[PDB]
Amino acid sequence: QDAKAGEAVFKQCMTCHRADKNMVGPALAGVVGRKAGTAAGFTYSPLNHNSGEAGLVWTADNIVPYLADPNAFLKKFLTEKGKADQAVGVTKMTFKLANEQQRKDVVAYLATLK
Ligand code: HEC
């Protein structure tokens, strides 16, 4: 949860993500508190879109486990909601971050991206 230390982790996210514009991935400014699959102008996968449609809002707490394994997180979310059939595909985000402290720091960084 050290946002300054999260800057260095955020350099990897900048391959695909900017704060205000879409690129390979959606724009991330305001992502903490945003309904999944809704950055204006971004075309999301069905797995991410259906997760937000089922109510998923990204928070400082749930982005941490998400970053360890995006597919697993989103599948488990829709399964828990009784919507396992909507989680058969995969996300466009092919990156994963294993280290828990790095995930917590980068999420503290994201929370400052207003
Ligand atoms: C390119 C290889 C990426 C890397 C590096 C990072 N992300 Fe990503 N992210 C990528 C895509 C293509 C998408 C769209 C996913 C889909 O299935 O449509 C995403 C999505 C996210 C999200 C969800 C955003 C939303 O629902 O609006 C988050 C919270 C996210 N990505 C965070 C994130 C972080 C913090 C990264 C660095 C640690 C990171 N991503 C790397 C592509 C890529």
From Swiss-Prot:
- Asked if Transport is a keyword of the record, the answer is yes
UniProt PTM: Binds 1 heme c group covalently per subunit.
The UniProt annotation places heme c binding at C13, C16, H17, M93
Q: What does the entry give for GO biological process?
A: photosynthesis
Question: Which UniProt key words apply to this protein?
Answer: Electron transport, Heme, Iron, Metal-binding, Photosynthesis, Pyrrolidone carboxylic acid, Signal, Transport
Question: In this chain, where does the modification Pyrrolidone carboxylic acid occur?
Answer: Q1
On whether Translocase is a keyword of this UniProt record, the answer is: no
The record's family statement is: Belongs to the cytochrome c family.
> What protein name does the entry list?
Cytochrome c2
The upper taxonomy is: Bacteria, Pseudomonadati, Pseudomonadota, Alphaproteobacteria, Hyphomicrobiales
Q: Give the encoding gene's name.
A: cycA
Q: Which residues of the full protein are shown?
A: 26 to 139 of 139
